[PDB]
Design a protein around this ligand. Structure first.
Ligand SMILES: CCCCCCCCCCCCC(=O)O[C@@H](COC(=O)CCC)COP(=O)(O)O[C@H]1[C@H](O)[C@@H](O)[C@@H](O)[C@@H](O)[C@@H]1O
Lengths: 576, 66
């Protein structure tokens, strides 16, 4: 047709019954006899919506092996790319644009084997689509972490990897990157494909001539006891995209961000890293922060009470110690200021992650800002520099709760505090503030004088009721007394209804929701701490490898050895 | 323990449904384009020789179990 470019062969293939249509063979034979068959069999759509689709794609979609075999036999191009709008990211289905990826993604193993090792035209197992995705990238992409999906995707991945090893022993399929620079493992880690990551990190292939594809090995076996080795290649460090960096520094939109750190090698690796060298550094930093806050508190406590700063120094011991403390406090403030700038520049957030993540950086930065404003006011001959200083002092103590991580119980407790504040208290406070403002305006309107002459004073007086410090004496001689009493009683009853509803709403969340979430959120926080400590590290010596360079196979397909920096785990099984 | 959360979610859904119906019922400006996906040719083969159009609604889904 002139609109789409569809030809007779495509029409015949799209309208076959019971797997058969005699028109196809007649068309192919007539094409063979007329001038040639190559231009006829390789016809394809020209419209943008189904651009590039040809006979092989239709044959694979219908799950008709005979048509696939005949089309390949007749000279159809197995490397035809279907890159229409329907075949990429509205309605559509992305399968990698190629017949080999189409067969792999539809769980048709026979077509995959035929395409790879037919007699006429084998497929290119290392080919890439427009996005740069190979067959394995396509298999990762079509995963949704359900049971049957995980089963078939894992089996197809394993089979294709083994066949690629057999056909091309010198080809490393898993090292091929797409346009974004991601390998299939990095793509799975960044996309939240928990099942594919769990399969890849601990796969065991025990077959001749391809056991080097494994990542989990057995070092030795006694009876119920045995020792296993994990590869850790591109898990700890690879200078481009490690699994730990990708998981830890995600943008919080990944579905399984909390669960991807519970797979067997990563949890033990992070615990080992914590126990090895990070714990002492964390405790040292906590100690230094405590000393800083003590010095700041002591310096602020003994301030002079004269007017119009700056104040002169006397030739006496106390003034020297006081000014030393002030200088140290200012130094700490500017240090935290520059650290906050470094964080913001090195991570480049887009104001969404800061809204839902990384609160501690914001709080420390705000503390430093208050300190700087205090300095500016101090040298400007103002008394208000005290008012800023105390706001930096009080925050300086509450930020100490940051260091509750590194201790499991206090870390879970602090995480629970954080999530309670950010989930339920906001919903409570919105409604409470609406009610308070409404009744405050009503009371100011009713009584125009005598502690209810302003909105601020009335708001404070009504707020006092919420904390059990109210005033219901009714001693004054108001004009609208006995109407005021009704308003106050109604306000009190409604406020206590709201508090009751909040309290009860927080009981429905203790059905084993917050505990399971917190147990993993604390672990993610500790992982971020470990990675940051690794990154800064202030020693300039990178000899602290994590698990030692062991010989794992010693025999690649080539005669060279095989060292992999493996990680040892001991296991015991009494069931044989 | 279980009751109130499920009950409240369904009651909120019913409230929003009432709001939608009340909004589109009056609307005070006479816009009648409240219909859905359009007069698609549903079957095209009635028991008689004519065809049928039904103002259908599209739903797309995925199933990996065949
Ligand atoms: C004078 C006036 C004082 C007011 C001070 C008010 C209490 C201060 C308490 C200070 C405690 C410091 C702290 O530990 O910060 C808390 C934030 O608490 C708040 O809610 C502050 C509300 C603003 C935790 O935030 P965190 O940096 O751990 O971010 C988490 C990630 O690490 C993790 O990977 C997850 O992505 C997780 O989803 C993230 O949340």
């Amino acid at each position: 047709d002139p609109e789409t470019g569809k030809t007779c062969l495509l029409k015949a293939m799209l309208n076959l019954h019971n797997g058969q249509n005699d028109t196809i063979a007649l068309l192919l034979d007539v094409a063979r006899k007329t001038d040639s068959l190559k231009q006829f069999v390789n016809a394809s759509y020209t419209d943008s919506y189904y651009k590039g689709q040809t006979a092989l794609h239709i044959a694979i979609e219908r799950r008709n092996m005979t048509l696939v075999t005949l089309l390949v036999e007749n000279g159809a191009d197995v490397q035809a790319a279907a890159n229409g709008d329907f075949f990429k990211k509205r309605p559509g289905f992305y399968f990698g644009e190629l017949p080999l990826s189409l067969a792999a993604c539809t769980n048709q193993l026979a077509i995959v084997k035929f395409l790879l090792q037919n007699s006429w035209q084998p497929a290119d197992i290392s080919a890439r689509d427009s996005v740069g995705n190979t067959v394995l990238h396509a298999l990762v992409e079509v995963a949704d972490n359900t049971v049957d999906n995980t089963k078939f995707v894992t089996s197809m991945y394993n089979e294709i990897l083994i066949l690629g090893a057999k056909l091309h022993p010198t080809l490393k399929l898993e090292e091929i990157t797409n346009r974004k620079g991601l390998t299939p493992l990095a793509l799975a880690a960044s996309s939240g494909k928990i099942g594919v990551l769990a399969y890849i990190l601990q796969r065991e292939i025990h077959e001749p001539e391809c056991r080097h594809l494994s990542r989990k090995f057995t070092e030795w076996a006694y009876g119920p006891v045995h020792s296993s080795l994990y590869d850790l290649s591109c898990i700890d460090t690879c200078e481009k995209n490690s699994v730990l960096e990708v998981i830890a520094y995600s943008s919080s939109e990944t579905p399984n961000r909390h669960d991807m750190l519970l797979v067997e090698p990563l949890n033990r690796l992070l615990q080992d890293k914590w126990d090895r060298f990070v714990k002492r550094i964390f405790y040292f930093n906590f100690f230094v922060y405590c000393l800083y806050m003590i010095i700041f508190t002591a310096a602020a406590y003994y301030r002079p009470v004269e007017g119009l700063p700056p104040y002169k120094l006397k030739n006496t011991v106390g003034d020297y110690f006081r000014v030393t403390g002030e200088i140290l406090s200012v130094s700490g403030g500017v240090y935290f200021f520059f650290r906050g700038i470094q964080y913001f520049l090195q991570r480049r957030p887009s104001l969404k992650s800061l809204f839902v993540d990384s609160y501690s950086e914001i709080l420390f930065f705000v503390q430093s800002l208050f300190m700087l404003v205090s300095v500016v006011l101090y040298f400007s001959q103002r008394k208000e520099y005290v008012a800023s200083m105390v706001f930096s002092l009080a925050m300086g103590w509450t930020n100490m709760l940051y260091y509750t991580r590194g201790f499991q119980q206090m870390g879970i407790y602090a995480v629970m505090i954080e999530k309670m504040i950010l989930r339920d208290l906001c919903r409570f406070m919105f409604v409470y503030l609406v009610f308070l403002f409404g009744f405050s305006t009503a009371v100011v309107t009713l009584i125009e004088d005598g502690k209810y002459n302003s909105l601020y004073s009335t708001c404070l007086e009504l707020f006092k009721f919420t904390i059990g410090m109210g005033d219901l004496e009714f001693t004054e001689n108001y004009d609208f007394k006995a109407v005021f009493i009704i308003l106050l009683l109604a306000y009190v009853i409604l406020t206590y209804i709201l508090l009751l509803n909040m309290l009860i709403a927080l009981m429905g969340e203790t059905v084993n929701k917050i505990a399971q979430e917190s147990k993993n959120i604390w672990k993610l926080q500790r992982a971020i701490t470990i990675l940051d400590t690794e990154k800064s590290f202030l020693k300039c010596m990178r000899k602290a490898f994590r698990s030692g360079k062991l010989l794992q196979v010693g025999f690649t397909p080539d005669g060279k050895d095989d060292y992999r920096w493996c990680f040892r785990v001991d296991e015991v099984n009494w069931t044989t």
